[PDB]
Assembly symmetry: C3
Homo-oligomer: 513 residues x 3
C-alpha cells in the first residue's frame, strides 16, 4: 500500500560464555546450607497395619520445627499370585501398576494444627500422571511409566514388566529388579503360584503435600498436630500388574492374588531451621491445587461393528453431562471417558478414545465442534498431555496381527490391542469465549455442559458401561500463620481486577495461572 | 603474585525462599484458543495419487497461527511382497513425509510471495534441529542412522507402537500417526494401508522452529499457499530392507489412492488485554540456498566393508562460489544421486576430509580428521551418532563371518547414512576479521570434500557434493498490510564495534 | 488470622511479546575456531601394548582449549573364544576407557604442576555427573547397572549401533566409536578388533565438567601432559559374561598391539572483539582425594541370592580421618578389591547402612535405610537406578526356578553393581554450625558402612571401604605467565555472615 521500509535494528556479537572470563570482578565463592538427612523420621501408624492392606490407617505424630513438604509412604507386603499355568517362566510378566501407593488410597485426610484437608489421591494421580513432567513423576514413584495400550505382553518390547536387566532406561519399567526392592520366593516343581515380597517408597499425593516439587519442596513449620488418615485400599487390583500373555490353569478365568504381611510407614525429614536463614516469615504460602469431579454421566455402550474394523465405522457413542454449576472459573478442566468395570483385575486401565468434544459455557454453545481427534490431542498436549497419539486415540494398535488371514474371524477380537484412550485437558482461555469475563480465577458464576463422542473396545454384539467425567483443577493456596493456624482458600478476584492486571509474558514466585 | 580476594555467599535451597505476600503474585491467563480452528480445503479436488499442483486460497481476519499444518490422508497399496510375509515391524513412513513430498511452495500474504523448497529444507534441518521441536513438526521425526533397516534389528524405526518404549524413535504403525491395514487374504502378495499425517509446513515465512508458541500473523486479506504436490511413494513410504520379494521382482510397487489434503491453522481475535498490536511485527524466516554443487562417477576398487583405511578416497571440489554477503552458516553433504531402492534410507557419503578456501585463504580444515569434523558439525547442532555421520561399516561381525561367502558379504553390509557438516564463518579462524556473519562483504568460497562411498568393488555410482548457505533473513509485517522480507546485513565496521552478547522481553535474532 | 492480599498478573504466551524494532537486536557472531586444531604427538613413540609413560610437550601461543582430548588407537586380539561363536552384541569397551587407563597424570602450565588421578576421578565422577556432559566426555559413557552383561538381555551396553535406538546406551561396536573387525577364519577361537577412541582428559586443571564451552587457557610457554599409561585390556576391553570359552580356559586372553596416542586441542588467536583479556583468570578445578580406607575379608555364610534380610551384613569402619578444613562433598564406596574376571563390570558392595562421626557428634544417619541412602546420594547427583545402587539380586526368577539346581543358582545370579553415597556436610545436620563447606576449621571424621556382598555361601573376598573428599579448589592464571592453585577457604564467621544465594555474567563457584 504505502511507503514501508524495514526498521533499523541494533546489532550485537553473539559470543561463547567461555569469553566471559572468570575474574575477581565476576566470581563469588559459595558455601552451603541445605535440608539435612539426619533426624529423618520413620513414623509407624497408631495401630498395627491391616494385614491384607485394606482398611483405615492413621499416622498421628506431632513434629517440631521444620518438616519436609513431600512426605512419602513406604509399603511392604507379600503378594501370592495363584492360577498360573504350571511350568510358566513368568519372565518379564509381573510388576506393579503405575503409582501403586496413590492408586491404593481413594481418600486421605491430613490434619495440620487442627485444619483438615480432604483429598482423593487415586483420583488425583489418575489425572496427574498424564500431564505432569515425567522427571517429577519418577521422583514421585518408582513405578512412573504410564501404559500406552490396553494389553501388555512379554513378547512385545513396549512392556513395563521388563525387569531391570531387560531395561536400558529405568523410567520405562514397573518390573522387578529395576526401581524397587523385591524378592521372589523359591518356586517348587509343578507349582501354579508365586510369592513375591515388594517394598515401595512413594510420595503421598494429598493436599497440602508438595508433590509437584519433590526435589526442593517448601517445608512445613511447627506441626504440633499432624495426622495423616488414609482409606487404605492396598489390594491386588490397585497394586499388582500381570502381563496379558501369562497363561492360566485350566478352568480359571483370572489370577487370584492375596496380600499378606502388609506394613506401612510415613517417612519425612524433620529438622531445626539453620541460623543463617534468620527469622522465618509470619505467614507462609503453599500452592495446593484443588482437583474436583464437577460432573459425571454414564451409559451402556453397545458395539455393532468390529472395534478392530475400519476406524470410521466404529460405533460413535455420545455422552453429555448435565449442566454443571460453578461459582467461579477454574484454571483447567480434564475430560475422560472411563470403562466403569474392568474385565481383568491386573491389566491396564481402559478409557474410551474421544473423537469429538463440544463445550457449552453459559449461552455459548458447540465450542470445539470443528475439532477432530488429532486436534483434540494437540489441545490436550498444549496443556501438558504427555503420551503418544496412539495411546490417546484408543485406535487399533496391532493392525497387522488382526489383518492376518491365519487369525480366524473369531480370534481377531481376542488378539486386538487398543490405545489406552483419551484425557483432554483444556483451559477457559482455550475456548475463545466472547465473554471476556470468563477468566481463570474469576469469581464469576458459570454453567458448563460437556458432550464427548467416543469409541470403545468391546466386540461387536457386546457392550459395557462407560462414564464421562469432567474434572476441574482450581488454583488454591494454603496459608500457615505464625500462631500455628492453617487455612486454605481459592484465589478469586473480580473479572475487572483480572482484566486490568499487568501481563506476564515470560525470588518472585507466581502461582496459579 | 597472590590470588585475589573473592567474596562469599551461602548457597541455599529455593525452598528457603519462603513464599509470602512480599514475593507471591497470582496469575490468571490469556492464551491462543482452539475455537475457530480452521480446516481449509484446497480450491479444487486434490489429485487422487498425490501428484500435482495444490492451492489453498483463504483470507483470514484478525490473528492466524504462525505454524500452519497440512493434514494428508491416503491409502498406499504395496505390491510384490512374498506370500505369507508377516510384515511385522517392517512398514512405515519416511522421516517428515509431508515436507519430503513438496519440492517447492509459494506462500502469498497480502500480495507478497515467498518461494521456498520444503523437501530441500527439511533434508538439511532434520540433522541439526532440536529433536523435541522435530517431534512437534512431524509424527515421523526419527532420522535414519544407517543405510538399511531390518526387523531383526532393534534400531528399527518401523517397529510399531507396541514395540516402541519411546514414541519419538518410531515412524511405524500404531505409534504417532493414525493408520488402518485392510484385511489380507490367504496367499496375498500385497497390502493396503490407510494413513493420516498432520505435519507442520516448512516454508517461509512459517514459524516451524517455534511450533509450541509461534508468533501469529495478522490481517491476512490475501492468504494463498501453492504446493508442488509430489506425494508419491518414494517420498512417503518406508519398507524394511528384509521384507522379501515375489520371485522375479526387483523392488516393491506402491500406489497411492484416495489422497486428500487440508491446511489446518488456528484463527482468532486478539484478546482485549494485549491492547494495540505494534505497527511493524518482525519474524525470523531463515533463507536456505544451494550455493554450489558438483558431481562425479565414483568407482570403488576396494571392498567398502574392508579395512577402512583402504576404502577408496573420492574427492570433489566445487567451482568458486561468489557470494555478495557472508552467511551465518554453511552445510556440506555428498549425496548419492540415484537411489537403487525406492523405499530405503537416503544415502550420503562418509566425509573424511574437508578443505575450505575463502578469498585468498586456502586449505582451511585440512588438519581435521573425521572425528574432528563430527565435533565441528555437532558444535553447530548436528544431532546424530558418530556411526551415522561417519558412513563406516556398521555390522562388522556379520561381514567378518567366514560362513558368509565373499559374494554375500557385500549384500549383507550396512553402512552409516553419511555426513552433513555444518560450519559457521567464525569456525574458520580467518585472518580477515571482516568476514563475519551478516557482513555486507562479497566473498568467494571453494569447498573440497574427501569421502568414501558404499558401492561394491568394481562398481560405482554418481555422487553430488552440495554446499548450502543458511542466511539470517527477516519478514516484516506492516500494519497497512504490506509484507516484506530482507537479509539482515551490516558493514563489517558496524559489526566489529557491536557489543558482545555472552549470555527477558528482549529478543535476539540471527547469529 | 486472615489470608493476605496478593497482587494479580495475567500469564500470556511469549508469542504476544511481539518482535519489533523496540525489542529485537540482530546478532553476528564470534566463536572458538576449528582451524589450527592441534594434533600433538608424544615425545617418544607410544608403548606398543599401551603400558608406559607418555608425555606431550608443546608450547602453544595465544588461546588453548580448556578441555583437551586424547585420541587412542590400537588393535585388541581376544583369544580363548569357543569356536563358531557369533559374538553378536558381546564385545565393546568399558566405561571411559581412556581415563580408566591413566592412574596418574601431571600437567605443567608455565612451570606450575598439577598432579591428579584420572582413573580414580572418573570412577566417582561417572556416578553423579550430568549424563549429557558424560556423553561429550567419552563415546563410552553408559555406566553398568548390574554385575554381569549378557547378549540374551536387553540392557546390554555391547549392543551394536544397529541394535541401539539411543546411542548413549551403547559402548558397543558400530555406534559411538570407530572400529574394524578383522576377517575371522573358519574354526577360529580368536578375533582382532581395531579401535579408535577420542576422550576428554579428566585431570586438573582441565575443564572436563564444561566440554561444550570451556574457558580457554592462555599463553602456555610451557605445556606438558605427563601420563602414567596403563592402556591394558583390563582397563579398556569389555566382554559379555555369556561369551563361551574354549575347553580348559578360565578367562579370555587379550593382547594390545599397535597402540598410538595423540593429544587433540583447539588453539587460536583471541578475536579482536573481546578486547583485552583480564590480568588474572580463574578456573574451577575441584580437588578429589582419598581421605581414608580400610579393608576386610568378607565371608558369606548365607546365599547372596536368598532372602535379602538374611544376607550377611558386613561392617567396615574407617580410622579417624583428620582434615584441616571442611570439604564440599564426600563419597563413600565399598569396592571388591580383586576382580575375578578381567573384562566384566566392576563390583561394589551394596551399602545398607551408614553411620558418620564428626568431632564429638556420633551415629549420624544411623536411622537411614537403603532407600533413604539412595535418596541422599541422588540429592547430590547420583545418577543410576535403585537396583544398581542397592546391590540386590536382580534376576530373582532365574534363581527361583526349580529347574536350576542349587549348585547352578549362584552361577546364574546377577546383582546390582552396588553403591556410591555422595553426601555434603550440610546433609549431616550438625549441631556445630561452624562445620560448613569451605570453612578453615579442622575436623575429624569416622565412617561406618554396613554392606552386602555377592560371594557364594561358604566363600569370601576382600572389600575395601573408601571415603573420598571433593574440595572446592581454584586455579589462577596471571598474565605474567604464573599459574597457582589453592583451596577456597574462609573462617566460619565469614561464612556465617555471608548473604544467602537462593537462586548472568556473574559466576558462583564452589558450593
Amino acid at each position: 500500500m504505502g511507503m514501508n521500509t524495514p526498521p533499523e535494528l541494533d546489532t550485537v556479537l553473539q559470543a561463547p560464555y567461555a569469553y566471559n572470563w572468570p575474574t575477581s570482578k565476576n566470581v563469588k565463592i559459595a558455601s552451603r546450607i541445605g535440608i539435612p538427612y539426619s533426624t529423618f523420621q520413620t513414623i509407624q501408624p497408631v495401630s498395627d497395619a491391616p494385614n491384607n492392606g485394606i482398611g483405615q490407617i492413621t499416622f498421628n505424630q506431632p513434629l517440631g520445627n521444620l518438616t519436609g513438604g513431600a512426605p512419602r509412604l513406604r509399603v511392604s507386603f507379600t503378594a501370592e499370585i495363584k492360577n498360573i499355568l504350571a511350568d510358566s517362566s513368568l519372565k518379564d510378566q509381573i510388576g506393579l501398576k503405575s503409582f501403586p501407593v496413590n492408586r491404593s488410597i481413594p481418600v486421605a485426610v491430613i490434619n495440620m494444627n487442627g485444619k483438615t484437608f480432604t483429598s482423593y489421591p487415586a483420583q488425583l494421580i489418575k489425572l496427574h500422571q498424564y500431564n505432569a513432567d515425567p522427571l517429577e513423576l519418577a521422583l514421585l514413584s518408582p513405578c512412573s511409566d504410564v501404559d500406552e495400550y490396553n494389553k501388555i505382553k512379554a513378547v512385545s518390547m513396549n512392556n513395563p514388566y521388563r525387569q531391570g536387566t531387560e531395561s536400558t532406561d529405568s523410567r520405562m519399567s514397573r518390573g522387578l529388579g529395576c526401581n524397587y526392592a523385591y524378592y521372589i520366593h523359591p518356586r517348587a516343581a509343578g507349582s501354579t503360584s508365586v510369592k513375591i515380597d515388594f517394598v515401595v517408597d512413594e510420595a503421598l499425593v494429598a493436599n497440602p503435600t508438595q508433590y509437584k516439587n519433590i526435589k526442593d519442596p517448601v517445608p512445613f513449620r511447627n506441626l504440633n498436630t499432624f495426622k495423616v488418615i488414609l482409606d487404605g485400599q492396598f489390594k491386588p487390583e490397585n497394586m499388582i500388574g500381570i502381563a496379558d500373555d501369562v497363561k492360566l490353569v485350566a478352568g480359571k478365568a483370572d489370577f487370584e492374588v492375596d496380600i499378606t504381611g502388609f506394613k506401612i510407614n510415613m517417612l519425612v525429614q524433620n529438622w531445626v531451621a539453620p541460623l543463617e536463614i534468620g527469622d522465618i516469615p509470619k505467614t507462609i504460602i503453599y500452592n495446593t491445587p484443588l482437583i474436583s469431579l464437577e460432573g459425571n454421566i454414564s451409559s451402556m455402550c453397545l458395539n455393532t461393528k468390529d472395534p478392530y474394523g475400519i476406524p470410521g465405522e466404529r460405533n460413535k457413542h455420545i455422552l453429555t453431562t448435565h449442566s454443571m454449576a460453578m461459582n467461579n472459573v477454574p484454571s483447567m478442566f480434564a475430560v475422560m471417558v472411563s470403562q466403569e468395570t474392568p474385565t481383568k483385575k491386573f491389566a491396564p486401565d481402559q478409557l474410551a478414545g474421544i473423537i469429538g468434544l463440544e463445550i457449552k459455557v453459559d449461552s455459548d454453545v458447540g465450542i470445539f465442534r470443528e475439532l477432530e481427534q488429532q486436534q483434540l490431542y494437540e489441545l490436550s498436549s498444549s496443556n501438558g498431555y504427555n503420551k503418544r497419539f496412539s495411546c490417546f486415540s484408543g485406535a487399533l494398535a496391532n493392525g497387522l496381527t488382526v489383518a492376518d488371514p491365519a487369525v480366524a474371524a473369531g480370534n481377531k477380537f481376542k488378539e486386538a490391542i487398543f490405545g489406552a484412550g483419551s484425557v483432554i485437558f483444556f483451559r477457559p482461555s482455550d475456548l475463545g469465549l466472547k465473554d471476556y469475563n470468563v477468566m481463570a480465577n474469576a469469581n464469576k458464576s458459570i454453567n458448563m455442559q460437556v458432550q464427548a463422542t467416543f469409541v470403545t473396545p468391546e466386540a461387536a454384539g457386546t457392550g459395557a458401561h462407560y462414564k464421562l467425567e469432567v474434572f476441574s483443577i482450581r488454583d488454591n493456596l494454603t496459608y500457615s500463620f505464625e500462631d500455628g493456624t492453617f487455612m486454605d482458600d481459592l484465589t478469586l478476584y473480580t473479572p475487572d481486577q483480572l482484566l486490568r492486571s499487568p501481563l506476564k509474558l515470560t525470588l518472585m514466585r507466581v502461582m496459579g495461572g
